[PDB]
């Protein structure tokens, strides 16, 4: 498969960042792929071409899918951005996403800046 490895930043995103978000109270809509049919969301997969969720990010971290932490960071920002693009700014889902991203940025701010392979 694709090249994967373990780095200090990937371990931090797993054992610190993902841990804080997975148990969060606002996390339940993000722990699995959006099911636009079950939720009745029109044109979701025509608008969202790259769906992403914390469940997929979690499995990728736990299976050493990522080569660098920047790939994992991109997946987190894809998940947030997809929420802001499809949903209306005052929908409940956007406020929950903004709250989760607030904790995300707070924990990522303390991430070790130098990425080293372990």
């Amino acid at each position: 498969k694709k090249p994967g490895r373990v780095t200090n930043q990937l371990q931090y995103l797993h054992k610190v960042v993902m841990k804080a978000l997975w148990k969060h109270q606002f996390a339940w809509p993000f722990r699995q792929p959006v099911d636009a049919v079950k939720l009745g969301l029109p044109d979701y997969h025509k608008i969202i071409k790259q769906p992403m969720d914390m469940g997929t990010i979690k499995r990728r971290l736990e299976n050493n899918y990522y080569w660098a932490a920047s790939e994992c960071m991109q997946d987190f920002n894809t998940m947030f951005t997809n929420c802001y693009i499809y949903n209306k700014p005052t929908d409940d889902i956007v406020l929950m996403a903004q709250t989760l991203e607030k904790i995300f940025l707070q924990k990522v701010a303390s991430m070790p800046q130098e990425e080293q392979e372990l």
């Binding site: 339940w28 809509p29 009745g40 969301l41 409940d92 889902i93």
Partner: peptide
Amino acid sequence: WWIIPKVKKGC
């Protein structure tokens, strides 16, 4: 859970 999907939650 959702009252109205994405728009308004119940919990």
